[PDB]
RNA sequence: GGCGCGCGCC
RNA sequence: GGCGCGCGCC
RNA sequence: GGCGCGCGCC
RNA sequence: GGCGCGCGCC
RNA sequence: GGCGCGCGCC
RNA sequence: GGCGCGCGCC
RNA sequence: GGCGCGCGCC
RNA sequence: GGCGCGCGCC
């Protein structure tokens, strides 16, 4: 069968307008025109509901501290390369040699689902329910893992641990502002490498510190 | 008629579950539990998806370098706001004096519509109509004005030219890395205030320079 | 948009 | 032959 | 009319 | 560079 | 969570 | 009496 | 078992 | 502070 009709197989959804779906499969590098750039654009906040909805439905905690780092990692290039894998995105999208990378995987992620959207004649009900038919397993698992993009001082860490068998050290350098709304400079140290990091609190200020630390190692 | 009867006929659609539509109302300062945090959460998803939709079928140009500008004041406190008025969220609201602001009434505008998607049995086809039918022309009119958010420059030189009808001067300091992939660093400056900024082009650069300037100046 | 330039990738 | 990043001139 | 900033198109 | 839209200062 | 502290607002 | 921001101790 | 980081609850 | 979940290093 033709490589559309693989793909509405994986996606058990068959286009009314094939084309649709063929833009949606296209980079900008294989055709200056009719390309996934709007549907991405699209499908961005329409995949971010579906994702947030299902979130807000099954996380153990309704609080927005608590929801807010789920998303982050819900709604991440990582986590859109996990769902787009089951449909074996890669092979489908028209692209030239040596521009593929996972931000087009995901950016083709979201086109697609833009284009099923549209192709419905924009039901965002039944779209909802055919990707919630598709994924809804996959992040509900994600969700009772308590995944979560690991924040600056852990990845850290993780790297002068590795790299030294040695944790970073924190130190206060200064305290501004009114009391009630104190300024916080905070210093990250590995060796001679150092960093310093601002916030409304001295665990904010050490994760800026632990933010730059890691840049300058990066570069060094 | 009671406040709830009030905001459903300004709202075009009446509640099943008043308790629905009483939370998005309420703020944690007058309630601990039952207040609006989880559905600003699921609001603000749900709303990005309503706005999107819209630009992205009425915006005369679908390039995404365009439609970013339009979506990030689409989807603003200020433009929220603007929204609400026509509600008068402002009186519904349960809050305790002196904490009402624009984002408090952004939160609940966002709230109310996750509230409305909940009740109607998560239809979401259905609540999208009823925002376009309150909504739709504001937002048509934003679009063909093309608002958008004043950007750095722009707000650093309205300054300068009130407070000292005098313009900011922009001037390149370096340029490192390599060549297809240079760092711009350039200064801006008015009177003796002065702050850096760093890009990958000279235009983004002295964007984040007066971006800076904004600050300390903000701050002096 | 036109005329060019440096760099990089296929 | 085709793309990309940046820069300059009109 | 001038100076300047942002964006679009050519 | 030109033209267009928006805006600030004169 | 408990016991406190500085500050701010009603 | 009620909230908020930050900090400390267990 | 130890040290440390993040988050949740009490 | 305690307990829980995740992880890094020993």
């Given at each position: 069968?033709?490589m559309?009709?693989?793909?509405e197989?994986?996606?058990?959804y068959?286009?009314?307008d094939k084309?649709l779906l ?20 699209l499908?961005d906040?329409?995949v971010?509901?579906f ?5 807000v439905?099954y996380?153990?905690?309704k ?34 040699r ?6 087009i995987?995901?950016?083709?992620f ?6 099923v ?7 965002a ?10 994924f809804?397993?996959?992040?509900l698992?994600a969700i009772?893992e308590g995944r979560v ?11 002068t ?8 050290e924190?130190?206060l350098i200064?305290?501004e502002?009114?009391?009630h709304k ?22 904010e ?5 632990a ?10």
């Amino acid at each position: 069968m033709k490589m559309l009709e693989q793909l509405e197989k994986k996606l058990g959804y068959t286009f009314k307008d094939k084309s649709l779906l063929e833009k949606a499969l296209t980079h900008v590098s294989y055709s200056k025109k009719e390309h996934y750039e709007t549907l991405e654009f699209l499908g961005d906040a329409l995949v971010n509901f579906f994702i947030v909805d299902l979130l807000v439905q099954y996380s153990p905690n309704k609080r927005e501290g608590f929801l807010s780092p789920l998303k982050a990692y819900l709604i991440s290039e990582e986590f859109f390369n996990l769902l787009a894998q089951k449909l074996e995105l890669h092979k489908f999208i028209r692209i030239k040699r040596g521009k593929i990378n996972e931000t087009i995987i995901g950016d083709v992620f979201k086109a697609l689902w833009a284009a099923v959207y549209i192709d419905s004649g924009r039901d965002a009900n039944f779209t909802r329910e055919l990707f919630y038919k598709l994924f809804k397993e996959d992040i509900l698992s994600a969700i009772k893992e308590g995944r979560v993009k690991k924040d600056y001082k852990t990845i850290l860490q993780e790297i002068t641990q590795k790299r030294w068998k040695e944790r970073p050290e924190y130190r206060l350098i200064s305290v501004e502002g009114p009391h009630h709304k104190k300024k916080f400079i905070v210093e990250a140290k590995i060796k001679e490498y150092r960093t310093l990091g601002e916030g409304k609190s001295k665990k904010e200020a050490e994760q800026r510190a632990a933010e730059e630390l890691i840049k300058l190692l990066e570069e060094s």
